[PDB]
Amino acid sequence: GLPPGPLENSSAKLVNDEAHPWKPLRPGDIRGPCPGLNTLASHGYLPRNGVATPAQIINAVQEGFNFDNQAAIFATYAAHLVDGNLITDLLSIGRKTRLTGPDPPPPASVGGLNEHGTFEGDASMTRGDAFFGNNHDFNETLFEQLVDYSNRFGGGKYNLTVAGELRFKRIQDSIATNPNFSFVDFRFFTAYGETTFPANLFVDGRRDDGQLDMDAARSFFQFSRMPDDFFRAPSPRSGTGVEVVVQAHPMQPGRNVGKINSYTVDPTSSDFSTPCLMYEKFVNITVKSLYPNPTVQLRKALNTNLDFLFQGVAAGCTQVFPYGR
């Protein structure tokens, strides 16, 4: 389907409403590394089994949380291209599942959002690095560290100052312990943006003060559950305030090189000075390497989804065409 447009009415409103109650997981229901999508599934803004189309995802993030359209489009089509089934138009928000349909050939994985190194990556706030065995479940120890950082830098609330400190702490901990730590290109970007989302989108929209309380934080991060009477944000947004997070502890993109404490800067990575390069590498390298020589129907699906992806790219970038036009 065509990507949905922006909300006709983007006011704050009750989103934990009669039509969208929280329900617990049934056997087979899939949740993954994204507390936003998890919460939308657990309130029925998405299918409750956690398998959805790109259009369903875009509508859900807008309706349920007031995620802005451009961000919704870029994130959703990026995820779908690398983790979803392009023929069936289905993406798992978590683990790989037969519910997304017949798989394409190797080397494409169609691994859902749980697939490490495509969208999901290291130094997540409340999820462990894939190297440590589980990149998707809520981790209590990591959440308690988020609480501790909120106590120390946020007066007990999570805000952009807390985000700046916690983002850096998680990077440093991965450098110290994960010999395979990777922090380049798309993950370098998303790792920063995601730390703003709890302050911008999990804060009740009647307040919109950037100060997330720990009861609400746990509700979203652990239980995929909106607080009782939760109002979404009062305008469309995504990653505003990311500048505060970066400014706290500016980092270069890089990786450990097969040992702990060996963080080595990658001069071929994009960074915040080269946003168009991030897009170009995502398409030319990441997507292309999953689908190096697609058959006719896959090529058509790839090109359609790549056109949609480009709608979410910041103005000023040039579209690239890995499979021609």
Ligand X SMILES: *[C@@H]1O[C@H](CO)[C@@H](O)[C@H](O)[C@H]1NC(C)=O
Binding residues: 34
The C-alpha atoms of residue 97 and residue 91 are separated, in whole angstroms, by 9
Tokens linked to 76? 């959703």
Q: Residue for token digits 């709890």?
A: 198
Q: What is the DSSP string of 103-167?
A: PPPTT-----TT-BTTTB-SS-SSS--GGGT-SSS--HHHHHHHHHHHHHHSTTSB-HHHHHHHH
Cα–Cα distance list, 205 to 38, 97, 221, 238 (Å): 19, 35, 18, 14
Binding residues for heme are 34
Q: In whole angstroms, how close is the CB of 259 to ligand SNP at the nearest point?
A: 29
* Of residues 75 and 81, the one with the C-beta less far from ligand SNP: 75
238 near ligand SNP, judged by CB under 6 A: yes
Tokens linked to 232? 């979404």
Number of Cβ atoms within 10 Å of the Cβ of 47: 18
Chain residues binding ligand HEM by CB under 6 A are 33-37, 57, 61, 65, 67, 72, 75-76, 79, 113, 119-121, 124-127, 190, 194, 197-198, 201
Region from 108-116, 132-140, 234-242, 249-257 binding Cl ion, contact rule CB under 5 A: 234-242
36 binds, among Mg ion, ligand HEM, ligand SNP, none (CB under 5 to 8 A by kind): ligand HEM
Chain residues binding ligand X by CB under 6 A are 9, 11, 13, 116-117, 128, 130-131, 139-142, 154-155, 159-161, 180, 182, 210, 277, 280-281, 284, 320-322
Tokens linked to 127? 């999820």
Q: What does the DSSP 8-state code read for residue 98?
A: G
| Torsion angle defined by CA atoms of residues 204, 95, 132 and 197, in that order, rounded to the nearest 10 degrees | -20
Q: In whole angstroms, how close is the CB of 188 to ligand X at the nearest point?
A: 13
Applying CB under 6 A, which of residues 74, 119, 138, 231 lies at the interface with ligand SNP?
Answer: 74
115 binds, among Mg ion, ligand HEM, Cl ion, none (CB under 5 to 8 A by kind): none
Name the site residues for ligand SNP (rule: CB under 6 A). Answer: 68, 71, 74-75, 189-190, 192-193, 218, 223, 225, 237-240, 242-243, 246, 272, 275, 278-279, 293, 296, 299, 313-314, 323-324
